[PDB]
Design an enzyme around this catalytic site. Sequence first.
Site, PDB file in Angstrom:
ATOM      1  N   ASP A 138      -7.677   1.348  -2.116  1.00 43.31           N
ATOM      2  CA  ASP A 138      -7.982   2.755  -2.413  1.00 43.31           C
ATOM      3  C   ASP A 138      -7.265   3.278  -3.650  1.00 43.31           C
ATOM      4  OD1 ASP A 138      -9.260   5.233  -2.132  1.00 43.31           O
ATOM      5  OD2 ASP A 138      -7.684   6.047  -0.873  1.00 43.31           O
ATOM      6  N   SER A 143      -3.317  12.700   2.024  1.00 43.50           N
ATOM      7  CA  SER A 143      -2.791  11.343   2.074  1.00 43.50           C
ATOM      8  C   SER A 143      -1.461  11.347   2.794  1.00 43.50           C
ATOM      9  CB  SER A 143      -2.597  10.760   0.670  1.00 43.50           C
ATOM     10  OG  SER A 143      -1.980   9.483   0.752  1.00 43.50           O
ATOM     11  N   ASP A 160      -8.780   4.190  12.211  1.00 44.32           N
ATOM     12  CA  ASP A 160      -8.860   4.673  10.834  1.00 44.32           C
ATOM     13  C   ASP A 160      -8.425   6.139  10.700  1.00 44.32           C
ATOM     14  OD1 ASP A 160     -10.021   2.243   9.793  1.00 44.32           O
ATOM     15  OD2 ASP A 160     -11.948   2.886  10.599  1.00 44.32           O
ATOM     16  N   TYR A 187       0.827  -1.206   0.000  1.00 44.29           N
ATOM     17  CA  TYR A 187       0.000   0.000   0.000  1.00 44.29           C
ATOM     18  C   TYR A 187       0.866   1.262   0.000  1.00 44.29           C
ATOM     19  CZ  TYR A 187      -3.659   3.274   1.715  1.00 44.29           C
ATOM     20  OH  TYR A 187      -4.526   4.330   1.889  1.00 44.29           O
ATOM     21  N   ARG A 236      -0.828   8.467  -3.695  1.00 42.63           N
ATOM     22  CA  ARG A 236      -1.741   7.532  -3.063  1.00 42.63           C
ATOM     23  C   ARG A 236      -3.034   8.229  -2.641  1.00 42.63           C
ATOM     24  NH1 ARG A 236       0.371   4.518   2.191  1.00 42.63           N
ATOM     25  NH2 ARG A 236      -1.110   6.011   3.125  1.00 42.63           N
ATOM     26  N   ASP A 237      -4.132   7.481  -2.660  1.00 44.91           N
ATOM     27  CA  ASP A 237      -5.414   7.977  -2.147  1.00 44.91           C
ATOM     28  C   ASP A 237      -5.816   9.266  -2.828  1.00 44.91           C
ATOM     29  OD1 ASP A 237      -5.237   5.912   0.033  1.00 44.91           O
ATOM     30  OD2 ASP A 237      -3.586   7.233   0.635  1.00 44.91           O
TER      31      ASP A 237
END
Length: 374
Positions: free
Chosen positions: A139, A97, A323, A85, A90-91
């Site tokens: 994601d 992110s 989270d 990941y 990313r994201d």
Amino acid sequence: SVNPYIGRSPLVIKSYAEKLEETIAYFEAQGDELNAARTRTVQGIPTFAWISDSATIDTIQPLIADAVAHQEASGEQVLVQLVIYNLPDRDCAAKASDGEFHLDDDGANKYRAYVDRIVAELSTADADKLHFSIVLEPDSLGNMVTNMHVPKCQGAATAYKEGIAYTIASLQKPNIDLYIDAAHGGWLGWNDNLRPSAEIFKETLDLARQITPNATVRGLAINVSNYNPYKTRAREDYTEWNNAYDEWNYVKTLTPHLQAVGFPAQFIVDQGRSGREGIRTEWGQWCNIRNAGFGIRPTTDQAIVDSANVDAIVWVKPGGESDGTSDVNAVRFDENCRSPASHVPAPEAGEWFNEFVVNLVINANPPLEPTYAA
Ligand SMILES: OC[C@H]1O[C@@H](O[C@H]2[C@H](O)[C@@H](O)[C@H](O)O[C@@H]2CO)[C@H](O)[C@@H](O)[C@@H]1O
Ligand SMILES: OC[C@H]1O[C@@H](O)[C@H](O)[C@@H](O)[C@@H]1O
Ligand SMILES: [Mg+2]
Ligand SMILES: [Mg+2]
């Protein structure tokens, strides 16, 4: 290609199991021996180890050494479960992110080198003794289906496909099975999202095959870090007009599209936080959803799984790892983490959220069987 989960013993992640000692101590202090014993059960349930930054690569060889020692001691066929990941940019649809690689700072090349560092760890003599199940890039590709109006996603689309393709092409070994992340029913299950999703998975696999000629993947991973039930008991109003209203139905509805494009239709399904339904008012609520329960325990039993297209139910996101923080003043504050359905206060992403785990145990469905010492 065969179901690598059958007969295998997915690895218990020691560093995760140790965190649950805090939860056991809480229950013991409440005079609640049943829930203390249920938490001991949870300690023995395998989860995925996430490699969400380059620093975490350092944990892989010790994990492998421990896994080999366990395989020798136990006689099991140990199956190490990993998440890769770290795509650049990313994201892409998130306001912020934590991903350390950025396209405008040589991120594509840096991602390849990060993959190469993982490959080296997964190519030792000890690694060769084990089997691996690896989820690729949560994601990511769903953003190319639904978020192409977002500048960062527009700018990252090619890089996501090329990055995942490199990861696939780099990890072709007889002892490794790969599952591309495929979001969850509430993201890609909508009628008009199914075909473009299948197409992008196939497009990515095709890119991988231009690097390593006969490269394959086992299939897809779904519901990673989400809460959707496998089979719903009470189908929720927010799922209206979505045929993927639980993850079992997501499998059934996505499968024909995968078959049509020639992409393998085998799935693993995260159920680690899926035990309790009716905990959200909107499908898009994802951060620390209050009263979440541990779901169906990791299994290949077809009496439960009830689909030739599902290899296994697994626990990918480790319950109890936050989270995201609820603190409005935090540098990394995400407003999603103060949704009306979120458990507040919550600590920083990845940090231990003990109150949340207490509730995961209490709200588990099926109820957790207790583990009492002999
Ligand atoms: O599924 C967990 C994942 O969700 C991401 O948001 C999704 C959401 O799950 C989906 O319901 C909605 O349709 O789309 C959004 C993305 O646009 C969330 O951004 C991630 O942090 C989270 O890991
Ligand atoms: O909790 C498992 C993983 O979840 C991801 O969303 C976070 O970015 C990681 O820091 C964490 O290791
Ligand atoms: Mg950063
Ligand atoms: Mg603490």
